[PDB]
Amino acid sequence: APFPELCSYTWEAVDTKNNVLYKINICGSVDIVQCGPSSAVCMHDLKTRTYHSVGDSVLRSATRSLLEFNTTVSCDNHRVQSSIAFLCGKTLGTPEFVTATECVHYFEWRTTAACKKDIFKANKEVPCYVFDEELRKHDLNPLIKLSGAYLVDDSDPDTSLFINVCRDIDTLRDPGSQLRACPPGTAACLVRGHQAFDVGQPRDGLKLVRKDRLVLSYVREEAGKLDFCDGHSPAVTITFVCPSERREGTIPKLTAKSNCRYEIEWITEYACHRDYLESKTCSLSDVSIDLTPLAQSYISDGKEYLFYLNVCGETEKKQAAVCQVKKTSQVKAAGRYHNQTLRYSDGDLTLIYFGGDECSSGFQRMSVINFECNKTAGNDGKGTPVFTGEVDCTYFFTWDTEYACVKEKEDLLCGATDGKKRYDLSALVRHAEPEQNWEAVKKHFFINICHRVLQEGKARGCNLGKFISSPMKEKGNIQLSYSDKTNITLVCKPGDLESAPVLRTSCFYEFEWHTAAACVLSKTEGENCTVFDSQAGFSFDLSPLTKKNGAYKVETKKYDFYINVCGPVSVSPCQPDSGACQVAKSDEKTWNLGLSNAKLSYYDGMIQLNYRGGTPYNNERHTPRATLITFLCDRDAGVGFPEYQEEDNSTYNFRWYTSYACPEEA
Numbered sequence: 001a002p003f004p005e006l007c008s009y010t011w012e013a014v015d016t017k018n019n020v021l022y023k024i025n026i027c028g029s030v031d032i033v034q035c036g037p038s039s040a041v042c043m044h045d046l047k048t049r050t051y052h053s054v055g056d057s058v059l060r061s062a063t064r065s066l067l068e069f070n071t072t073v074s075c076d077n078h079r080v081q082s083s084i085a086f087l088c089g090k091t092l093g094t095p096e097f098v099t100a101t102e103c104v105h106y107f108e109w110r111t112t113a114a115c116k117k118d119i120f121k122a123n124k125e126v127p128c129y130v131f132d133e134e135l136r137k138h139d140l141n142p143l144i145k146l147s148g149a150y151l152v153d154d155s156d157p158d159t160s161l162f163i164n165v166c167r168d169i170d171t172l173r174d175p176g177s178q179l180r181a182c183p184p185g186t187a188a189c190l191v192r193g194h195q196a197f198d199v200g201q202p203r204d205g206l207k208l209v210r211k212d213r214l215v216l217s218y219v220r221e222e223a224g225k226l227d228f229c230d231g232h233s234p235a236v237t238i239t240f241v242c243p244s245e246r247r248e249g250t251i252p253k254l255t256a257k258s259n260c261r262y263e264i265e266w267i268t269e270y271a272c273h274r275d276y277l278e279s280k281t282c283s284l285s286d287v288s289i290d291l292t293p294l295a296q297s298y299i300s301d302g303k304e305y306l307f308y309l310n311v312c313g314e315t316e317k318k319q320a321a322v323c324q325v326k327k328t329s330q331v332k333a334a335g336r337y338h339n340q341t342l343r344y345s346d347g348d349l350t351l352i353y354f355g356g357d358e359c360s361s362g363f364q365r366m367s368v369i370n371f372e373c374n375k376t377a378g379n380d381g382k383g384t385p386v387f388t389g390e391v392d393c394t395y396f397f398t399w400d401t402e403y404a405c406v407k408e409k410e411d412l413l414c415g416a417t418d419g420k421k422r423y424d425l426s427a428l429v430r431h432a433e434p435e436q437n438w439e440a441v442k443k444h445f446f447i448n449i450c451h452r453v454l455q456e457g458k459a460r461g462c463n464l465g466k467f468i469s470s471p472m473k474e475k476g477n478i479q480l481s482y483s484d485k486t487n488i489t490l491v492c493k494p495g496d497l498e499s500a501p502v503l504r505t506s507c508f509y510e511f512e513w514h515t516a517a518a519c520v521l522s523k524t525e526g527e528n529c530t531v532f533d534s535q536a537g538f539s540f541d542l543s544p545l546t547k548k549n550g551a552y553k554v555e556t557k558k559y560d561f562y563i564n565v566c567g568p569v570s571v572s573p574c575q576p577d578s579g580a581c582q583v584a585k586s587d588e589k590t591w592n593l594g595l596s597n598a599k600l601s602y603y604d605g606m607i608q609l610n611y612r613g614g615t616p617y618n619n620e621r622h623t624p625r626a627t628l629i630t631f632l633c634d635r636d637a638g639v640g641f642p643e644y645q646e647e648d649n650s651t652y653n654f655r656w657y658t659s660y661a662c663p664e665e666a
């Protein structure tokens with residue numbers, strides 16, 4: 001019951017309505033001063049910064065699915081208590097708030113840790129959620145792959161980085177996969193043809209670094225063999241960002257990869273806040289869910305009792321959704337419609353019946369149903385409740401049914417891949433522009449790509465214009481299925497972004513478009529601070545960012561870095577030829593992080609600068625320092641500021657979000 005895979009972390013659940021945050025530690029105690037020592041569940045209040053412990057680590061007991069943390073302080077009932085109802089899950093999960101009184105506090109937790117067979121357990125998994133400062137919940141548990149991995153986008157054809165989110169990669173029951181050669185325990189697998197190396201393992205949980213960005217770090221450390229990483233400990237730092245109209249969705253992209261210190265930006269909807277829904281219904285609402293189909297008697301074998309459940313209706317003393325009968329025939333109501341509560345809470349469907357007859361103790365009976373998704377449940381889809389424990393006369397049940405399976409995506413990307421080949425239509429996108437729409441040859445056929453129509457001649461602000469689903473690689477081309485329908489075929493025409501879609505076919509519609517946007521993406525280089533993508537139509541030019549008497553200053557804990565774009569830096573201690581320079585804030589000792597130059601690299605929306613001159617290190621290898629600046633497209637960032645990436649002591653990577661990297665330039 002004190003499952004190991006959950007110990008050594010302090011978890012968090014939130015009473016979204018009463019404005020309360022609970023900290024849970026199922027093995028030790030919360031590290032906090034303010035709710036004393038050996039508090040296993042520490043309640044605290046956002047109104048009234050008042051931190052009251054509501055479960056002690058020593059006073060711990062289990063009964064069936066429930067783990068119980070009792071206290072000695074009194075409430076009256078009599079003493080304050082916290083329970084967690086455990087269900088087997090597909091990932092490590094997070095405890096969710098169910099309900100509380102002034103005595104009891106109830107949580108539920110779907111986790112692999114409560115599964116009895118160890119096949120469902122990852123070699124190593126870490127918490128995969130954060131709370132922001134509005135207590136809104138960012139949870140990446142849906143991105144976690146139980147089998148396989150995600151290929152990270154990179155320009156190099158000979159090597160591929162594969163990652164999983166918050167756990168290692170499961171290579172099993174897929175022997176044909178190229179991942180098979182990857183050593184076990186790896187969250188981040190580098191393959192070079194036929195070798196497979198471990199460049200990162202799960203360590204700590206998801207962090208929130210600067211109000212909005214989720215950061216996860218894989219490390220290796222205890223391995224040794226810096227084969228081709230020349231002295232550096234391999235590492236992977238993923239940065240998860242919530243899509244905008246400043247920055248729309250992407251696949252995971254490799255923004256840096258020197259010295260086996262890999263950096264990954266990944267813009268995906270699963271990074272945005274999770275909404276906590278509620279109602280006094282059997283229906284909720286991102287997307288809908290309806291539990292009225294199950295009102296169809298349901299019964300569950302209890303301790304020495306039977307439970308009778310009629311959820312959502314009476315099926316025809318009464319007014320009692322759940323009734324308890326001792327197997328002797330005296331009966332008690334365990335919950336009624338006088339307040340029933342249906343919660344969808346970060347993927348968890350939970351139903352409480354708050355009525356109930358008062359028991360011999362001071363408690364008024366209560367019933368909690370945790371619905372689980374099962375398409376092939378039984379009772380042709382409706383399934384059947386299972387009694388899973390009782391505490392202070394609250395009775396818990398778990399209920400597989402197909403009518404709990406409502407798990408909708410819509411992280412629609414405007415690209416497509418085919419092995420390592422990637423395609424991206426972002427150049428066609430016209431977004432609330434001074435630009436017009438596209439017009440092929442309403443009123444006139446007006447088209448936009450992975451975006452609503454613009455009101456330039458005005459069509460229909462959302463005749464029928466669809467505008468959902470991601471594009472796919474059809475018969476040698478890219479197909480875009482606009483669904484209510486319009487099928488758009490886009491054909492690679494190197495160099496041409498100027499031309500428009502065409503006629504072809506009049507409730508079905510078909511357009512054909514020859515565009516450089518339909519060409520496979522590839523890496524290009526340029527000089528004089530410009531880079532020309534010839535298969536696409538255009539060039540990027542970062543020269544406006546070039547300072548004349550340089551210095552973009554970048555302050556960290558111990559260092560100030562001074563860098564310029566495509567020209568040298570010019571401040572007090574630095575050598576006048578470096579494009580990047582490190583000054584220690586206590587000592588003013590200075591390192592040269594590489595000579596400036598104006599050769600731009602460009603691949604799939606990332607522009608790169610590499611300074612390579614650089615003060616040597618203290619070793620036989622002659623190894624001079626180097627600097628990487630990755631420029632990333634942020635439409636409304638403007639010129640933007642550089643940002644140092646924390647790595648080891650000998651890697652100098654900067655990220656720079658700027659409009660000048662976005663597909664509006666020369």
Ligand SMILES: *[C@@H]1O[C@H](CO)[C@@H](O[C@@H]2O[C@H](CO)[C@@H](O[C@@H]3O[C@H](CO)[C@@H](O)[C@H](O[C@H]4O[C@H](CO)[C@@H](O)[C@H](O)[C@@H]4O)[C@@H]3O)[C@H](O)[C@H]2NC(C)=O)[C@H](O)[C@H]1NC(C)=O
Nearest residue numbers: 525526527528529530531532539543566567597598599600
């Ligand atoms: C970045 O800018 C610098 C200037 O500060 C530049 O050095 C210059 O390089 C070019 C080409 O290497 C030199 O020659 C030409 O200047 C004339 C102006 O009359 C242009 O017509 C030229 O265009 C052609 O240049 C080459 C000449 O054969 C061709 O190979 C090329 O394909 C073009 O068709 C070019 O601009 C120029 O004289 C120097 N400047 C000095 C002072 O020596 C540097 O080369 C630029 N980087 C580039 C262009 O990639």
